């Protein structure tokens, strides 16, 4: 779908469908009133019949009206006068998109300037959320199913003053949504096909397509020979061997320290790193970004790791693997040591790490921990502006003893209490060299059931926003 | 909702909303084509734009069209050029009703004569299903919540020849839907209000309202004094005492044997008997119908029955109560002995009796067992014609040993194998005096939830259809 | 054991043991009275002492009596005058066989003509059940244990009119019992020894021994190369590879369409196919019978299929393998596609498929589903005449949605409700090309515990009866 911005009057634009908002009590803002007047009162005449109460997202679709150049006018409820919160605004946009998807119209014009969104400026933040909802909602994953939609273009109308800010919002939302689609395809792919070697092929192909990107893949023997005893212990059980994939984007000055993203690829952590990199390549951000994808397949077999095994991590710390299903933190901890070589200014790991995070923060909010208050605050602020929120949990020292082992430097589990925090605590012991934060996306990376089951693409908006903020874009 | 039938031309009829069907490829049957012609090709013109693909239940709502008397036209998809099955036809009607309930029109006209429904005649069977779906779909249970709908009347258009048969379908569906509303309200009432004494007061109120109905309520001491040891044992643990409620409707000839319906009232079995009785009263069927509601509340306490207790049933047979959660069969078996006094031609018990029936037949199909093939077959056929299906399970003699007790004449459980059948087998030992069937509605009596959730109307259409069949209506 | 039929008088026959029935109240039928008279009243004299009450199966064994040529006379209770049901009649026959097994007599004569069996003619159906019980009860499986019985021959006496029908019963029961023994040996063999390659060797050996039989075995690579993605996914986890074994018996006319039996061989479904084929070869039935044994071993390992895998079946439909323990339907669905090539007049799959069938129909009755009402009725009638009963469950379309997947054409599980039906529903989607039925023998193929633990040989009597019915034998 092409997204464009114009500043011409809504009533003047030739289009298959013009979309205008209508509030409760059939209240029309200035944009809607101008279109009603161009229609000689035809829109207000239908509204007086009472079929559209105006609650957010309710719709009434009209056919060809004399006086307008639109073939159809879609009226969409904007609710009470109050400014809308982010969820209501995105639900209104998705309700519009739903109707448009079902029509045989080749384009549409959205004339929603009058809709206020709480705490967001009328041109950039409001349209960041509309454009991301509109483009992410085009996603289809029908590869394994045994009809192309008519809608190819949407025009957003804004006043001439606000045009460049709406265009900037569209540019950034398009990059985010393209990244998200990549993340959602990799997550949705079934595990027979999406294994560590497939991810390594996807990264080598992405490297060949981008000048400023260099890709290295470390295979099982290299992981073992680097001393990555925890990462090797997770992968050994499977016939599909592990891969540590490095993707190094040099978009900054040569002596700028890079941002490092570490993704758990057992694999929506790794997928969100690929998606954020794809967004950064689209935007050509002027940062140095090193992506480390820690990929393995955790399977039972006659050569698998067994509860009670003790391994030497790359750092030299030993770990008692009490539970082989606490495996993400094992491939992560060796990859955090590996990240030291880049001399980074921030290292952020993203992982579907704990069922306990779903108990603490559910499906709405990603769990965030770290060793640096400024980096944690930057990620929280990014999530608020991107509408991809996180929330900090504490790594107080009192939780660390839960990982003590009588035999090794630490165990990999902390017991039933504070499970998201003790996993963060485990990882912190490998992150002391640099400013680090950990994002547990076990609750926000996918939808379990319904027809909406499948990957969400989170946290590509928060990560891409954080890197826009560091680039000063 | 008032529901009436007319045989006037659709384009001629004054109404807030006219509903007509459109097939795939914008194909119009005779009725729709006539309204298109009256509209001066307005309906075809909009169809050519392609917003309505015409899959079953899809919709497109038009406003005032020149040449018609209807204020609005709703187009609804009827699919390809082949007859619909019951489920698809009922879903189409519910789609139409959903749109109408959201509009501010005080009436609507359905002109859906051209839609064929597989194995249902165009006047009676087709409209039994439409009218019940429409009328049951109006149900609201908002009494415990802290806006009435505009739609007050629907007119169905049929040709002059079929009018009386559509009217007879509306008469029968209206009685069924009014019975189902009563059933659903009693099921959805919470248990601190809907206890056995409440149901006794419901029955006594119904007895006052109706001439041919006599109601007697037997209290705990009566049940104990009649020797109903198994029914007494279920109720004794609660502070709410049990009631056996008798409602006797003498609509037949004096010497005609009655049909007896026995409902488990622990309580949707008993509620479906109340709702079938309310439909029979509305229809004034010329049958003798005796309803026996076996009502108790099964609670833990210091005076409750305890696993291993042995009781003497009214029949004199002893039962070892191995599980106190197999309680519905205990109140039922004594009520089946009580039913012998009526010298019935059929005794049907209805009960939410086994989780095993949900494992066997799920949410769609009621489990059915009996001692008389003709009666079982009459109930199956009634279910097919009412679109409230059941399915027989065998009461082979080989299952009876699973009830053996070393101490008593039987135990009340049969173990983990064949649990719906062994409950039927237990009840069959009390039904040998008469032609008997048992309906296990544990899967079909409510939605659980889902996200929209509550009692079904489910016993009522089959049972009402069986009594229309016996009354030769 | 040799089974023969004669029509001479019971008292005249030289034998180690003559067996006669005695009813309650010491009532003697005409055959028993004639033997009493030949013994000069010695049998009635012992009976007046009261040790034998005559309940079915009770026994009294006499020694050498003057006047008879039998060395011993066994009196067996036949109960009250009523005709016996099938179970009681078979239990009486097994009680006789029990005594005979313990004696050092080389032969025995059964003179049980007077015993009536409910709904069975005195010569064919009555003796079908006696002869099958007598010969199946000879079964021994002592291969893995670290004494040969004296009884080598039994003569059944009947009147000369009925001799040829009793002989026909014996011929058909012997074929069934021989088939059953083969089925019971393959089921009883332990899984270390009985793996898919062993079954393939058993089928190639059976092919070499029968002129009208051709055997082909498809190995793992052939299964994969045919596109059988579901069958290959089940077997891949194990070190023992899968086999699809084809056994084609051409006993009919060349242009007669064959009957196809599909057996799950994970393996009593496959075993019952081998046993039914062995019975058909013994009888030289004039039908074309193609047997397809879908054999694999379902094991965990580092290369096993994992919940969430998506595979392409031979048909091109894709399946999401939600649960790797729903594996029978996976090897079956690709074998049902394979069966299309034979252009069959009936395809029947037999499988130990669901624990839910044991909840629905227990150990007594096999679950039956299909897409053709005539074939389902034929199998039900066969099971009633063979005393190997089945019972139909419905494949209503409403159960099909339980298999929907958001990613693939279907999932392989339907949830906790209606599990036997949803497995049938899954299979039906691969059976549309032909008349098909599915037999779930999870409850009837073996006895779990006791000393009687082990395979039953069911449903070889129902399947062999169905093929006798189609041959017109």
UniProtKB/Swiss-Prot annotation, chains A, B, C:
Presence of the UniProt keyword Transferase in the record: no
InterPro entries: Leucine_aapep/pepB, Macro_dom-like, Peptidase_M17_C, Peptidase_M17_leu_NH2_pept, Peptidase_M17_N
Catalytic EC class: hydrolase
One Pfam family linked to the record: Peptidase_M17
Cofactor(s) required, per the database record: Mn(2+)
GO BP annotations, alphabetical order: proteolysis
Superkingdom classification of source: Bacteria
Keywords for the protein's UniProt record, in alphabetical order: Aminopeptidase, Cytoplasm, Hydrolase, Manganese, Metal-binding, Protease
Entry annotation: catalytic residues: 329
Keyword Amino-acid biosynthesis listed: no
Reaction it catalyzes: Release of an N-terminal amino acid, Xaa-|-Yaa-, in which Xaa is preferably Leu, but may be other amino acids including Pro although not Arg or Lys, and Yaa may be Pro. Amino acid amides and methyl esters are also readily hydrolyzed, but rates on arylamides are exceedingly low; Release of an N-terminal amino acid, preferentially leucine, but not glutamic or aspartic acids
Protein EC: 3.4.11.1, 3.4.11.10
Chain's role: Presumably involved in the processing and regular turnover of intracellular proteins. Catalyzes the removal of unsubstituted N-terminal amino acids from various peptides.
UniProt-recorded name of the protein: Cytosol aminopeptidase
Taxonomic lineage from the root: Bacteria, Pseudomonadati, Pseudomonadota, Gammaproteobacteria, Pseudomonadales
